């Protein structure tokens, strides 16, 4: 996360870090809890993963240093990858992974709510994106969960500033005009979260943009709501 | 229908009792007509039905004792079941009849408009269960079609009280947090009618619950304005 | 267009011609461009259309004595037509155009855009229907591009005026209740184009009516907002 600051233990608690545990385990990317054996996340983050089996879903962490051998995870089922995925930058940015059990929702750890088809006209002004990402472009992985407040804009805006993609409905923009608070690498399959009528929504994934938090490039989402029939569908 | 009362004769003109008339002729469930050729009801009421030949339609009915023998009825030319359908509880419990020959409007006879899709965020404080089913779990079914006042709850809160159950987008829910007021068996198939802008809109398909009126257990009910793209490609 | 005026040199910069090259060159319909190799239409224009080697997409044009043997044109690399279309009175009637090159943006040819599924249940009150059609049901197609302002009807008022027809929640209809101003002949596959918070949204694609500009008729349009999902799928 570019421009942000360390979180409070928990303020965040549908977010996870998702590891890979081969060559050596390390932090892949982030992802939500959605339902108690049930993470949303990207589906570019499972390039070139051949088996669930190498890949571990750590809840309830606020830093990377809490994460050891003898930490618990959940083993992953199965990665669903949205059958029209091709890449990130257009579009179907979505995956699930079922666990191989089922969380226990806590304080520490418990799922996010995903927008209703009716919120399409929604205005959400109280928007945060979180991650143990890159602080700028040519960084590491962050030991402790960063938070940003960013500000969404309108689609119609998000297109001017990507002449050269097709900025779709399935998607949400997010970025200060000037810059400087966004995403960054390690970020991805993160959510975008924001608040309203008192309660936290799944607004967004975090999916790609022209380098990270840079003037006139917002960060670009897949829009949840979009896909709510599919994640229905899947999660059978 | 627990907790209601009587109704006025033809205050519910798109209220149909779907009979079958094997081993001895019986009411079934009931249904909406939404046009002249069609009713709207659920999956669940064809359980063992093998052919449409044993079901015979009622519409302009107040009383159960209208119906003997003589009585004029519509013939099914063909029930048509949500190819996604399972049962009740994991939803999609919809189904349509289609009429051998065609209902001639009228007063005691008429349809019900279908929700819009634009209807998504509207708050409906004017909702109504009707039926000719039990006044609790364990009685017989009613002669005069019954009706009942239910204000809606939300899917969180509906939600809460169903734990072991998935309640969906494509579910809604109505009863009091006490109880005493509900569909029970009998009722299925029927509508839920909500009266908005002077105009009533078939908000829901009666389908189930635990139990009938129990504090804490609201009705359930397909959430029919998710479905109006399957009604309207099933109905050509 | 019946009751209509004049348009001013480029008020309707994505408005096109389609014409068809054979027996000899004439007006086929109307079009909209929507993105740089993409023009919206009707799907019933191309009946009988075997190729698109014969359809030429004019831009930029306010009289059809602009057009000459030297004047340029686009050429259609492919027709996309609706996968459930059979006739535009039972809808689905919407096509693509692909364009050989692409459009080069001016203030005399620039896309409109499309509705958002979130804007459902605005309520346009600036509404407007273009084309070269006939000024009456026996006419002939018109030299310059002829504008009308219409209400939009609802769909329970339009369906009360077409009882022999389906109206269905895929179309849209506008007209005077007394009449006077409609699209006619030669004005199909143009926009339905209304102003909302400063910006022109393609609402309808003029598809069909009973006659034209006649009392209790009005015009049906096919809604474009339905179809969003779709025009992202073939755009790609
Ligand atoms: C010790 O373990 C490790 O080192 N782990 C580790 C794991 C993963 C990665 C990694 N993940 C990605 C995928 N992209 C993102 O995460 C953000 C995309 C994005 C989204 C928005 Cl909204 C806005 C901007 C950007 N954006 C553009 N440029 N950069 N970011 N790339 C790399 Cl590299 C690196 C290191
Ligand atoms: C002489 O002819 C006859 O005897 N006919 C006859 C025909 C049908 C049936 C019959 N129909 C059903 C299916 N369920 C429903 O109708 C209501 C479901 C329901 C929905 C809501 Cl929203 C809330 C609660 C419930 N709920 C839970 N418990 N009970 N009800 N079960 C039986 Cl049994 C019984 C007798
Ligand atoms: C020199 O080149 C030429 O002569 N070119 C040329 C090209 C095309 C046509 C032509 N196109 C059509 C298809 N229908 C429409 O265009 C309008 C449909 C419509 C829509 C609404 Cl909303 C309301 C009313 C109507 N409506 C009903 N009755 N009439 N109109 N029919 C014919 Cl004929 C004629 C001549």
New binding site residues.
Partial sequence: IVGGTASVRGEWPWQVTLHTTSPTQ????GGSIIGNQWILTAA??FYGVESPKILRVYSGILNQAEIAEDTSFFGVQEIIIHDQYKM?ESGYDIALLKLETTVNYADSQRPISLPSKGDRNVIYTDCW?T?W??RK?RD??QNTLQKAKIPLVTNEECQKRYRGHKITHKMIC?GYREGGK????????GPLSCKHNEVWHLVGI????????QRERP???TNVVEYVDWILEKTQ
Same sequence: chains 1, 2, 3.
């Fill in positions: 390390r932090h892949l990317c570019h983050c990130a994106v991650g990402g890159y472009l590491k992985i997010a966004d995403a960054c690498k390690g970020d991805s399959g975090t999916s790609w943009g022209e380098g990270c938090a960060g670009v989402y």
